[PDB]
């Protein structure tokens, strides 16, 4: 197998994650899709680190994991705050700000 396949998979995964953010109203599923995007980035970083014979890409993947966890937690806090008032976790429900 040619190693570049790993990148294509990432390109697919990221793409799928992006599409998910567009297609799913649930905020939690949106968080899952953002996690998919960040992990596709991590896969690309790991593949390139292997390609260049150094671990820097792996370190970046680790830091991206940290960032993904923190962003997920912040999004969960925001969604808790919204849900406690609106009793809904749909992104489309936050439609007041428009035009």
């Amino acid at each position: 197998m040619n190693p570049d396949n790993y990148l294509y998979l990432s390109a697919l995964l990221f793409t799928i994650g992006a599409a998910g953010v567009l297609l799913r109203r649930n905020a939690i599923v949106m968080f899952m899709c953002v996690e998919l995007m960040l992990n596709a980035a991590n896969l690309a970083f790991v593949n390139f680190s292997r390609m260049h014979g150094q671990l820097d890409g792996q370190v970046v993947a680790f830091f991206t994991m940290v960032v993904a966890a923190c962003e997920v937690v912040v999004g969960l806090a925001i969604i808790m705050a919204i849900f406690r008032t609106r009793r809904s976790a749909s992104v489309d429900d936050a439609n007041l700000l428009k035009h």
Partner: protein, 519 residues
């Protein structure tokens, strides 16, 4: 051992230490004393930061900057200039954030004049929220968060490596996500703004990190100087480099607010707390454009012929869609958000210049416009309806100047600065960026920006029409001062906006000296 340049890193170090100390105050300080310490700790901490910056600036009078942490951070003249700008804007923004209720019979004034709900976890309008408001409680955790945001922003121009830049982006983004949802009034809109900003910011940051991955693959390095060496030497892939530049541009453009990525700015600025909006519209724009400057002047100058055509379109769109969409706006805050979009476009015109004049013009533009935006939003935060909510409906501002000539004149000054009228810092600022663009072969962008400014002057002027030329309505809003801090912020901001218009050579020499990044 790895040498650490604490002196160079003294900025962002004072700030992060102060944020940590503020979290400690939250953890182990009695409620009644949390706010006085935090505001004392925050403001002073930033003042120290400002001092640190100038000291660092003096240290840089010799060598043209230097790396600090074995790469991953570089304090060169542009970086220190942007850090000083961000520190000053943060001082003003925290002065806005610390404003409490003007006065009341009960002592429970609860940092509400700064639009911060006493308890964000409380359901909007619930009996719990009312009881918390009555008791005068208030979540001082806002002050640490702001520090962290400033921290991240202070780092974002100075990040010399892709990983550090991404980490700074996240560090400044998360506190802003949280802060956008803490508004005291119209809590539903503020929560919607926080959700939109979080979703789209996470989206853009995913794009940002994917672009960083592409760049790393192309160059096998994360340092911006290393990527520049790779692209210039042709050792890189040259397709992954372009793809990574595009995906990274996605993130930075989202942060600044280009049209393909602007949509978050109107809603977020409308819904977020007025003080938080004022601080953010300046500081985040400054930090994002600093990072963009570093990317396009240090990391990837060699591919100018490749990414220059793209930015043009972006800039063009940003100047057109940003301004035209503002023409029909009926909300002051929403209109100012679209103005921020258009001014991001104007900045991008100077960034496209790809010449030292471009760097100087961008730095000056960011300083002046951050000040002007902060002042405009601070003034907007004072116009209160009868119910007490910030009266943003533009029609309700009719005759506002005829009732409050001082505030009306100050807001008109800010609006004319945004429009780019001469004798305002905004005109010097637009002239700098457009001159840099013209010298850089982008005079079509100068023409398009001129037409965009002509369009935008209409909606900047409509506010003055309503404020002064129209009679006040029967239920017209009224000013709430509400304290010395807000007045000081408004006065300092207006004074800077006027001085940088009349006498710009001060700080313009500083911008000129900051024309060179360390490669």
């Amino acid at each position: 051992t790895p040498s650490i340049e604490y002196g160079l890193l003294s900025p962002m170090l004072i700030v992060f230490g102060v944020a940590i100390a503020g979290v400690l105050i939250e953890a182990l300080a009695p409620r009644q004393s949390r706010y006085p310490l935090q505001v004392t700790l925050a403001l002073g901490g930033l003042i120290a930061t400002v001092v640190a910056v100038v000291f660092v600036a003096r240290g840089l009078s010799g060598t043209p900057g230097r790396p600090a942490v074995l790469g991953a951070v570089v304090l060169d003249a542009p970086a220190v200039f942007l850090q000083g700008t961000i520190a000053l804007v943060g001082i003003l923004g925290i002065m806005l954030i610390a404003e409490r209720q003007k006065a009341t019979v009960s002592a429970g004034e609860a940092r509400g004049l700064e639009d911060f709900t006493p308890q964000a976890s409380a359901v909007a309008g619930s009996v719990a929220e009312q009881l918390a408001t009555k008791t005068g409680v208030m979540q001082t955790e806002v002050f640490p968060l702001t520090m962290f945001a400033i921290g991240g922003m202070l780092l974002f121009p100075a990040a010399d490596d892709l990983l550090t830049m991404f980490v700074a982006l996240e560090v400044l983004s998360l506190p802003l996500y949280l802060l956008c949802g803490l508004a005291r009034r119209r809590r539903l809109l503020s929560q919607e703004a926080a959700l939109k900003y979080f979703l789209l910011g996470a989206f853009s940051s995913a794009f940002f990190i994917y672009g960083a991955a592409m760049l790393y693959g192309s160059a096998g390095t994360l340092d911006l100087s290393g990527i520049a060496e790779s692209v210039a030497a042709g050792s890189g892939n040259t397709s992954l480099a372009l793809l990574g530049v595009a995906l990274l541009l996605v993130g930075v453009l989202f942060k600044v607010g280009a049209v393909p990525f602007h949509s978050w700015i109107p809603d977020v600025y409308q819904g977020a707390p007025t003080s938080i909006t004022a601080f953010m519209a300046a500081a985040t724009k400054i930090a994002a454009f600093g990072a963009m400057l570093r990317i396009f002047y240090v990391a990837v100058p060699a591919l100018r012929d490749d990414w220059r055509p793209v930015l043009w379109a972006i800039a063009i769109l940003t100047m057109v869609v940003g301004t035209v969409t503002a023409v029909t706006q009926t909300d002051v805050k929403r209109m100012l958000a679209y103005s921020a979009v258009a001014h991001s476009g104007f900045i991008l015109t100077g960034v496209i210049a790809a010449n030292p004049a471009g760097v100087s013009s961008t730095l000056f533009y960011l300083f002046a416009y951050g000040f002007s935006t902060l002042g405009a939003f601070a003034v907007v935060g004072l116009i209160r309806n009868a119910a007490g909510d910030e009266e943003t409906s533009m029609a309700q501002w009719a005759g506002l100047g005829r009732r409050y000539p001082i505030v009306g004149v100050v807001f008109s000054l800010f609006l004319l600065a945004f429009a780019g009228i001469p004798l305002t810092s905004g005109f010097v600022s637009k002239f700098a960026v457009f001159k840099a663009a013209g010298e850089g072969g982008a005079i079509p962008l100068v023409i398009i920006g001129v037409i965009a400014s002509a369009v935008a002057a209409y909606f900047y002027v409509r506010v003055i029409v309503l404020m002064f030329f129209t009679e006040p309505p029967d239920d017209a809003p009224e000013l709430v001062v509400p304290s010395g801090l807000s007045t000081a912020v408004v006065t300092v901001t207006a004074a800077v906006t006027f001085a940088l218009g009349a006498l710009p050579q001060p700080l313009l020499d500083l911008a000129n000296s900051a024309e060179t990044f360390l490669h």
